[PDB]
């Protein structure tokens, strides 16, 4: 059924699965009109679809043109996410199609279920985990390709860079969730942490800096300090 800490290890077994986050699909700025009213202007968005085992990220850019003349955009966004997840599955070879798709928000369940009726043997599941994938747009290269796009576009990334060469999926997922959680709680401090040392570089074909194992531990510790603190600065403790 729903995914949680009691079945956490299932994500790294050998069943192909994808997480789907829709939190950055429909994005707006809210501003004042000449008449002193309020209006939204949409900006480009993305669907974050992620294989947690391999780190493959199928970033579907959502161009603001897809909203022109549409009503009830927040509800349309969920359906448009389902239409695009479904299209991605249909484009994959059969041996590559997921056996489960896990949505990060329960409102996606009916939309995806309906778009995936043709795949009775793919399970569409929610989760109780509070995953920080919304912060995906605090990764500069991801934000860059999204904001520069002028038409709909599917871009492929490995969100784990080369990590699996040296660590397990379990551990790479754990690092990713800690970085993103830090980014979500205090983006500025999170980012200062990652780039402070200018000798450590981000390789052109990577998203995160080239840290040694030792530097990663320091980084990971510092992100923990941040998350607890901001949780202090937040609850005064």
């Amino acid at each position: 059924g729903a995914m949680n800490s009691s079945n956490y290890a299932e994500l790294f077994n050998n069943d192909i699965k994808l997480f789907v986050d829709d939190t950055n699909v429909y994005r707006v700025t809210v501003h004042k009109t000449f008449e002193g009213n309020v209006a939204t202007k949409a900006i480009n968005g993305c669907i974050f679809t992620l294989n947690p085992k391999t780190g493959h990220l199928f970033l579907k850019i959502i161009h603001t043109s897809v909203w022109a003349g549409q009503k009830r955009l927040s509800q349309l966004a969920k359906w448009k996410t389902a239409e695009e997840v479904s299209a991605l599955v249909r484009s994959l070879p059969k041996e590559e199609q997921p056996k489960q798709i896990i949505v990060t928000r329960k409102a996606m369940l009916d939309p995806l279920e309906v778009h995936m009726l043709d795949f009775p043997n793919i399970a569409i599941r929610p989760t109780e985990l509070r995953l920080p994938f919304s912060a995906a747009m605090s990764i500069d290269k991801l934000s860059d390709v999204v904001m520069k796009a002028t038409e709909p576009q599917m871009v492929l990334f490995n969100i784990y860079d080369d990590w699996l060469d040296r660590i397990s999926s379990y551990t790479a997922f754990s690092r990713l969730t800690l970085l993103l959680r830090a980014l979500k709680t205090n983006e500025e401090s999170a980012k200062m942490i990652l780039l402070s040392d200018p000798t450590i570089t981000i390789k052109s074909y990577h998203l995160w800096p080239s840290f040694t194992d030792e530097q990663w531990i320091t980084i990971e510790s510092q992100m923990r300090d941040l998350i607890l603190t901001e949780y202090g600065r937040k609850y005064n403790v």
């Binding site: 349309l76 359906w79 389902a82 239409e83 009916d110 939309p111 279920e113 309906v114 778009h115 009726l117 043709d118």
Partner: protein
């Protein structure tokens, strides 16, 4: 006026006739039910004193034969039997009416309740949902499951209601996914009304037949079916104005007749609050909303 005679009442039982009921004691002199309005379907049903488990009963239409009730002591229920010898039926029934051994179907002349509960219910369509072709009457009980429930195990004993499933390819046109799931007019109007039921009178007759199996037998799957057929209309933006008006009358009498103490189980909060407040038809069921509010303001 027609007559449902009984060979004898050997076990203590509560007898139902349409929306009425009366108690009969073990081996009390009792030979049936007289004055049954011709022209309607009827249901005669049974709850034993010794075992409130399993209500059961027989749907029948007096124009389709002479039918008597006889207690089977092996299978232990009151069975519906047909006597083809017409002159003998007239005689035994006359014999019992002379000895005044029959209770009188107690219809009030002002009362259009059974008519309004059974407006579209036809014996021909009942027999297609309850398949036992050798009999003109049809047996239902509390525990009989539906075709759709058998998909989620004796098929001869099933209720073959029309399967309605909102997350199904039938219900959802490829490339209209959001449209058809949010606004089911195409499932209601093309797939169901034009495709399967052919007309709304057949739709309504199943709907009514489901509700009544729910109310009289506590048949859970019949209640599911009743709410599903309500939901599909409430969930459709485009419904003929005449269907809506009739649905409002249909539901009004069903809600009216529902025992107040069974509402907790029989009524689905989610469906009704959608029909009356959220859905496209929130403003179209004035009579149903008025009775639902003045009688069951709790469910809402």
């Amino acid at each position: 006026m027609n007559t449902v005679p009984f060979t004898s009442a050997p076990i203590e039982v509560t007898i139902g006739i349409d929306q009425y009921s009366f108690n009969v004691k073990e081996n009390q002199p009792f030979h049936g039910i007289k004055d049954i309005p011709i022209g309607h379907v009827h249901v005669i049903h049974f709850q034993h004193a010794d075992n409130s488990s399993m209500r059961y009963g027989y749907w029948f239409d007096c124009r389709m034969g002479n039918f008597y009730i006889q207690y089977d002591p092996k299978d232990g229920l009151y069975k519906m039997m047909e006597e083809r010898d017409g002159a003998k039926f007239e005689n035994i029934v006359h014999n019992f009416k002379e000895r005044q051994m029959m209770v009188s179907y107690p219809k009030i002349d002002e009362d259009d309740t059974w008519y309004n509960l059974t407006e579209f219910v036809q014996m021909d369509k009942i027999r297609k949902i309850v398949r036992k072709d050798e009999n003109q009457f049809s047996y239902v009980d509390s525990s009989m499951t539906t075709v759709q429930e058998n998909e989620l195990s004796d098929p001869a004993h099933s209720l073959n209601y029309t399967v309605i499933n909102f997350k199904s390819r039938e219900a959802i046109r490829p490339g209209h996914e959001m449209e058809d799931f949010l606004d089911k007019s195409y499932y209601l109007n093309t797939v169901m009304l034009q495709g399967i039921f052919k007309n709304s009178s057949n739709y309504f007759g199943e709907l009514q037949f489901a509700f009544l199996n729910a109310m009289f037998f506590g048949n859970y799957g019949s209640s599911l079916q009743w709410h599903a057929m309500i939901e599909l209309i409430c969930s459709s933006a485009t419904v003929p104005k005449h269907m809506l008006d009739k649905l409002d009358e249909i539901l009004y009498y069903q809600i009216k007749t529902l025992p107040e103490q069974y509402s907790d189980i029989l009524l689905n909060e989610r469906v009704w609050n959608i029909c009356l407040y959220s859905s496209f038809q929130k403003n179209s069921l004035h009579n149903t909303e008025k009775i639902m509010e003045n009688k069951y303001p709790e469910l809402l």
